[PDB]
């Protein structure tokens, strides 16, 4: 046994620390843990696209709710703001809908006016 | 669990014992001594590989050639088998041709 690995403990721990919050033997047994940790990391990587996709969907839903409170539909609101050259994005529009209802009311009135 | 729980006993190396201190002396015996002796004559080791190098098949052929008659019976049998096996491997197996 001229050369034997002496670090295998630490090599195992590097993986296991990421699996400690899993269910079942996936958090203890390296054979199972390593496969799930790889899947967890791949999901974490691929989730950066879905985070952005879902935030915009969330913003659109909130803007739709806020505009419907004022008789507008989301397409009308967005299109008419663009035509009035207001370049507020959906994140900001949702924030305004939640925290500045009078400003959002103003924007909805502006969009309806432009529409008319 | 494949990790020892205690530090191993300290290993103290005397870098200035006589062997290390005089290591390499007379490696230039030839070029500094009118070439009376070749540096390879300074090599202490098996008679069949003093001042010579080769792969395992060549080493085994040389060992059998030079000390084969002095080898123990089963050691010589093992050497003959090893030479046969290495011949087959080196001349019939491998990625390259």
């Amino acid at each position: 046994l001229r050369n034997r690995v002496t670090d295998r403990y630490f090599r195992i721990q590097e993986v296991l620390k990421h699996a400690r919050h899993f269910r079942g033997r996936k958090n203890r047994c390296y054979r199972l843990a390593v496969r799930t940790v790889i899947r967890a990391f791949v999901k974490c990587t691929k989730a950066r696209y879905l985070k952005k996709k879902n935030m915009r969907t969330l913003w659109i839903n909130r803007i739709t709710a806020a505009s419907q409170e004022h008789g507008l539909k989301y397409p009308a609101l967005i299109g008419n703001l663009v035509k009035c050259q207001v370049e507020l994005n959906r994140k900001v529009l949702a924030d305004l809908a939640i925290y500045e209802p009078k400003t959002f009311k103003s924007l909805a009135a502006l969009a309806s006016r432009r529409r008319h | 669990i494949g990790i020892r729980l205690t530090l191993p006993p300290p290993k103290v190396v005397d870098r200035w014992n006589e062997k290390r201190a005089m290591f390499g002396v007379y490696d230039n015996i030839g070029i500094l001594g009118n070439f009376e002796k070749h540096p390879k004559e300074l090599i202490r080791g098996p008679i069949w590989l003093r001042g010579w190098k080769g792969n395992e098949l060549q080493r085994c052929i040389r060992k059998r050639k030079m000390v084969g008659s002095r080898m123990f019976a089963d050691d010589l049998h093992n050497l003959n088998k090893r030479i046969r096996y290495l011949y087959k491997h080196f001349n019939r197996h491998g990625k390259f041709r």
């Binding site: 002496t6 670090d7 403990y9 630490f10 | 020892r4 729980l5 205690t6 530090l7 191993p8």
Partner: peptide, 26 residues
């Protein structure tokens, strides 16, 4: 026993860290 010192020392360092976390000094 496996020859070597670095893995053993690393394990000792990890043990010391864990000990400090479990029973931190006053």
């Amino acid at each position: 026993v496996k020859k070597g010192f670095r893995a053993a020392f690393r394990f000792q360092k990890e043990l010391e860290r864990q000990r400090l976390l479990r029973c931190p000094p006053p």
